Amino acid sequence: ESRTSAPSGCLTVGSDGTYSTIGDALDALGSSTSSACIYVASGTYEEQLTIDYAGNLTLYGETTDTSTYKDNVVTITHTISSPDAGSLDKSATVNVVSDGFSMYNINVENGYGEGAQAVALVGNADQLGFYGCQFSGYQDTLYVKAGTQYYSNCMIEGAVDYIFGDASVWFGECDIVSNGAGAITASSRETSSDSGWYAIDNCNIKAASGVSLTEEVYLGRPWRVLARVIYQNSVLSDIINPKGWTTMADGATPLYYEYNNSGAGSDTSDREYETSISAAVDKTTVLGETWGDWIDRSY
Template sequence: MAFMPRIILLLIASLSLQVQALPHALVKRASRTSPPSGCLTVRNSGTKSGEYATLGSALSALGTSSTATACIFIYSGTYNEQVTVNYKGPLTIYGYTTDTGTYKSNTVTITSGISSPAAGSLDKSSTVNIVSSNFAAYNVNFVNSYGKGAQAVAVTANGNMQAFYGCAFKGYQDTLYAKDGDQYYSNCYVEGAVDYIFGKASAWFGECTIASNGGGAITASSREDASDPAWYVFDHSTITAASGTSLNGQVYLGRPWRVLARVIFQYSSLSNVVNAAGWTTMAEGATPIYEELGNTGDGASTSARRFLTKTSAAVTKAQLWPSSGTSWIDSSY
């Protein structure tokens, strides 16, 4: 009987090695299918007592004067509304999902279809206009369905330390107004055609999918002062065409909305949608800082690039956010 423990130990060791050898993709990711403790609950179908039928009504219940930490959980559904987030304390919005690690399993969509000319301004056309600092959203789709013909914003992000995890932003022209402040986008999806990521935030796009649904420029940075820390950093992201769209060579990485635009694509996959010139013009007299480092794919060659600033060092989060640091982002993403 003395040999049994050794056999058992060998079996345990063998099983351990098999588990370690399993591919990472087989590890089940977390789901979020019920409200975290303390969250207000939004449900647009079969709303129960104590719940809210819209995101707007839940935000109204929170008010705009409290500084307490708050959260809102949204059940599956399409919510046709325009909302402004102006809560004074830290606020997190969670969408129902069976896989928190990706936008691909999102079941919550907030949508509207108003253009900037009709609304009176870019901010007012936004499906969701976020002016709060210390804000986070998980697994929510934000859509402006207006389509071609005018600027129409899905989200205006206009606050410091705003973070989006596994979210999707969909529009055509001016989809995501990353307007100002330190911002973090992780495992997100951004879709559009013309200047669809624009503004002057210090924004990090990590492991995101940037998908064009028409020809045009992806970014339009409005940085115009040399002391302005504004910078768009695309890190380990994928630049491609939206599903069902063929755009070989019709997409530019950016054009300068203001004269000192600053953007870098680093360690990312650039598909054949990217035009060989890489970057194009907008603001007269612009001297943009456009950088590319360590990218791969059919659109990654820089031999014919215009306006390219040479760089040999990747941008870091600490460099991007010298004042805010990195403690405010969810490092599990």
């Protein structure tokens, strides 16, 4: 589909919309538990946002093709590092603390670059759905901090611990793009009672254009001792180091898996830190039996 005007009932942001900034539209929602939506027209929005609406909010970006991130014309951008901001969450261009939030066809970036942690988006709530979005940074791009989260047909870019936190998260049909040497995932799962997983499913892992990273990228390292990550049914380019995974938390016992991957980076004969698994995991395992209630099935 093309989305070139506000869907039914949505507030409008843009040069010729009701609100000039995304922040103004978010403010306009006020305190309400009713479902709401905002349509953002083309532009670069130099804003830092906290999404804490009490109801179920959907944010839609303008695009000629909703099925991909490649035609997005809405960018939310801000630049600050976590040391300067005072925390990881405070460094985030977008901070999602609203259950049931969905975002479609929006790019989010932190422009800090290499040298310190600088979050593009933090997801810190349950039933978060992201469709056709881009998330760009270098160190700590996507803070999947907590809660059940689903990313479909998104582009996640960075170099160092750029998908990190303790969310239970499913990445489906995403392009995961390294722009520097480092580990892609850094899960902070830390207790046996934690039922969470990262599942990277039918994704494409590759270098950013113009950057040479052959064997310089790791699938992950353990931010805490019980990090659990599976890459399944995915394409892994020659960026993946033969060891596959690397170290971080002392005394870590990560649960790291691969199942039915392909590509130049998928040979498992020299891997370290892995566990055997005989089948791919499903979304019921990662997101709970109720995933069908909140995931948008058109992706």
